[PDB]
Amino acid sequence: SMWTEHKSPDGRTYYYNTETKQSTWEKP
């Protein structure tokens, strides 16, 4: 909901928290 994930290095998708501004690979 608050996170937006898209492909990235290593060939995986990271979740970018729009509000918080947290871009990483983890359980959002």
- CATH number, domain of 6, equals 2.20.70.10
| Vertex 23 angle, CA 17 and 24, to 5° | 120
Half-sphere exposure of 15 (CA within 13 A, CB side): 10
Q: State which approach was used to obtain the coordinates.
A: NMR
Q: Which domain holds residue 28?
A: 1-28
Question: In 10 A of CB 10, how many CB atoms?
Answer: 8
If one counts the domains in the chain, the total is 1
Phi (first) and psi of residue 19, to 5 degrees: -65, -65
DSSP string, 1-28: --EEEEEEGGGEEEEEETTTTEEESS--
